[PDB]
């Protein structure tokens, strides 16, 4: 039908009562109206700011919102109280609504210590607030005892935005808040607190993972809960995690490279909430969050058709800043955005038309060709949308001096279909690894995926580390194999850990596992420290490992985040080797995340 997106700010920071709002948690009642919550900080901070649980409800379906009211009060006079982060959860079943939120004293999360005791200042408090009229009035309870049941269990917060209630399976009507924890180790876990007693009694069930933070939970077709999170340990990507059991226990926790993160919140929902268990509809979920990995920034509506398996269809709803963001279904079956454009709480709502979508994830694979060849790649696209469509087309976004065309068979209900891609790379093309976007476009709307065409670079799974002068593998991961995985988070650092390490030079050899024309190098520093940066280097090679030729290339790198080229005429090699001679301001050290050799496979 029409797309839509609209928006509306609820809170501006500096105007109706506080200099800050942050942290967005929305819902839909029983009857039928919307419920925006979220901080006051008068203060600017986080807990243990003395921060209120506030609320806008809007009962015209969006357009227009009521006054702020005040769900939770902080106090900033003696005794000191804050109450932050709220996420709201309606039992459907019952009527009743809550909203969890901490309630601090002297601690925030990080600084809380261990015990239940609500008097107990330095403890950082699970309370949630009930409502059994619509969210009106409240009436507040402190939960923490219930949901601790490891007393190692140090700190913990309710992950603002909105629980669920199961609608299938032996736990069905079971209400569910995700938590994250410390432990005694000083790890942050993921655990569901539930209740199914509509919301009398809570409890925890089994904490799941490390390097966790705020997650959050949705029912799948068949029942099992999908748990999506916060990565804390910062990979730049989503955490994933699933339960059988209702949500009690989840099983080995992954990295999902489908969704970046750049280490903030997101909301995952079902986008038809009230479908059958085994359909079509049940299967497809919703995700909002910032899909930079950089920054809080490019605000992104994904849906899968799969149960979350796949993400073919993404939209961008806030190029610039977006923090926060939360989703829920609303009445007329569009979707209500809560989240934060850095001025406060901004409201927005859209629908599946907005989103252009079709569920129709594709895969075309990475593959490699030298300068001024022609490629061709097949596309598998798997057809969920449960319709034909007989006209499709693939549309590339790959850099426009090469030739791009693609292809693709007509889409069958249930089936798989096949194109191709032809990729013609002119020759001169620089050497490196290039993100190609495909758009599948369709009258019945788009999906995506990307895949990389690497021009002119050696195949780094054929080489290994010849030699290396130093390599730290004692107090962490510095093994000079590391430029050579692909992954830009590792690096090659030299010894530190002994005082005898030695300073600079430093050197590190690779074997190309064959002989190859080579005709450069490209260097990528360690991304997260600066002081141990090639600067002045030399590069060497070599037929057989022990008589090395050069250098056959010298320069000094900057210091420069990108791959830095070192060229040098070709030449047949199986070996290349840099000396880094000095750091960029003269410590002792060495890391490097990555090194490409430019020549020919
Ligand atoms: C309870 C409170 O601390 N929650 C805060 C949360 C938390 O500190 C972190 O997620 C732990 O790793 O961080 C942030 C944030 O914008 O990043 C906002 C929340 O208000
Ligand atoms: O002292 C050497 C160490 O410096 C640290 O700050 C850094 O995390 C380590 O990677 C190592 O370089
Ligand atoms: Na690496």
């Given at each position: 039908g029409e797309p839509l997106y609209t928006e509306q700010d609820l809170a501006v920071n500096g105007r109706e009562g506080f200099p800050n709002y942050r942290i967005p948690a929305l819902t839909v009642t029983p009857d039928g109206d919307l419920l925006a919550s979220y901080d006051g900080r008068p203060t600017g901070i986080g807990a243990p700011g003395p921060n209120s649980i506030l609320q806008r409800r809007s009962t015209d379906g969006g357009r227009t919102w009521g006054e702020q009211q005040v769900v939770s009060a902080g106090q900033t006079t003696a005794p000191i109280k804050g109450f932050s982060d709220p996420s709201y959860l309606v039992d459907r079943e019952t009527g009743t609504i809550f909203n969890f939120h901490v309630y601090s004293q002297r601690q925030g999360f990080a600084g809380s210590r261990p015990g239940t005791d609500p008097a107990d200042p330095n403890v950082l408090h699970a309370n949630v607030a009930t409502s059994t009229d619509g969210g009106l009035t409240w009436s507040h309870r402190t939960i923490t005892a219930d949901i601790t049941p490891d007393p190692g269990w140090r700190s913990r917060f309710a992950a603002s935005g909105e629980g669920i209630q199961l609608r299938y399976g032996p736990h069905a009507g079971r209400l569910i808040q995700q938590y994250t924890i410390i432990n005694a180790a000083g790890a942050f876990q993921a655990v569901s607190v539930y209740s199914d007693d509509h919301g009398r009694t809570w409890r925890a069930g089994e904490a799941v993972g490390v390097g966790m933070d705020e997650n959050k939970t949705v029912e799948l077709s068949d029942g099992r809960v999908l748990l999506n999170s916060r990565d804390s340990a910062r990979s730049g990507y989503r955490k994933v995690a699933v339960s059988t059991d209702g949500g009690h226990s989840y099983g080995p926790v992954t990295i999902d490279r489908?969704?970046?993160?750049?280490?903030?919140?997101?909301?995952?929902?079902?986008?038809?909430?009230?479908?059958?268990?085994?359909?079509?509809?049940?299967?497809?979920?919703?995700?909002?969050?910032?899909?930079?990995?950089?920054?809080?920034?490019?605000?992104?509506?994904?849906?899968?058709?799969?149960?979350?398996?796949?993400?073919?269809?993404?939209?961008?709803?806030?190029?610039?800043?977006?923090?926060?963001?939360?989703?829920?279904?609303?009445?007329?079956?569009?979707?209500?955005?809560?989240?934060?454009?850095?001025?406060?709480?901004?409201?927005?709502?859209?629908?599946?038309?907005?989103?252009?979508?079709?569920?129709?994830?594709?895969?075309?694979?990475?593959?490699?060709?030298?300068?001024?060849?022609?490629?061709?790649?097949?596309?598998?696209?798997?057809?969920?949308?449960?319709?034909?469509?007989?006209?499709?087309?693939?549309?590339?976004?790959?850099?426009?001096?090469?030739?791009?065309?693609?292809?693709?068979?007509?889409?069958?209900?249930?089936?798989?279909?096949?194109?191709?891609?032809?990729?013609?790379?002119?020759?001169?093309?620089?050497?490196?690894?290039?993100?190609?976007?495909?758009?599948?476009?369709?009258?019945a709307g788009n999906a995506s995926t990307t895949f990389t065409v690497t021009v002119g670079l050696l195949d780094q799974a054929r080489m290994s580390i010849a030699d290396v002068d130093s390599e730290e593998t004692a107090r962490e991961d510095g093994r000079a194999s590391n430029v050579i995985d692909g992954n830009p988070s590792t690096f090659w650092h030299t010894e530190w850990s002994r005082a005898d390490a030695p300073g600079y030079p430093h050197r590190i050899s690779l074997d190309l596992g064959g002989t190859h024309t080579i005709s450069g190098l490209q260097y990528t520093r360690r991304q997260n420290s600066a002081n141990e940066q090639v600067a002045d280097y030399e590069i060497y090679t070599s037929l057989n490992g022990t008589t090395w030729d050069g250098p056959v290339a010298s320069g000094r790198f900057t210091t420069s985040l990108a791959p830095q080229r070192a060229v040098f005429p070709a030449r047949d090699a199986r070996y290349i080797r840099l000396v880094a001679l000095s750091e960029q301001t003269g410590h002792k050290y060495a890391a490097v995340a990555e090194l490409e050799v430019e020549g020919q496979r």
């Open positions: 489908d969704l970046p993160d750049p280490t903030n919140n997101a909301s995952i929902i079902r986008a038809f909430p009230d479908a059958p268990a085994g359909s079509a509809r049940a299967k497809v979920l919703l995700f909002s969050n910032a899909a930079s990995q950089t920054s809080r920034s490019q605000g992104t509506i994904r849906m899968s058709c799969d149960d979350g398996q796949t993400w073919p269809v993404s939209k961008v709803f806030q190029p610039g800043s977006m923090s926060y963001s939360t989703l829920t279904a609303l009445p007329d079956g569009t979707y209500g955005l809560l989240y934060e454009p850095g001025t406060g709480i901004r409201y927005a709502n859209f629908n599946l038309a907005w989103l252009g979508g079709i569920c129709a994830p594709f895969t075309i694979p990475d593959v490699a060709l030298e300068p001024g060849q022609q490629v061709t790649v097949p596309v598998a696209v798997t057809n969920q949308s449960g319709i034909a469509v007989p006209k499709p087309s693939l549309q590339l976004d790959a850099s426009p001096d090469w030739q791009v065309q693609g292809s693709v068979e007509p889409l069958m209900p249930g089936r798989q279909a096949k194109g191709q891609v032809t990729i013609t790379v002119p020759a001169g093309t620089t050497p490196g690894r290039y993100r190609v976007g495909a758009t599948l476009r369709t009258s």
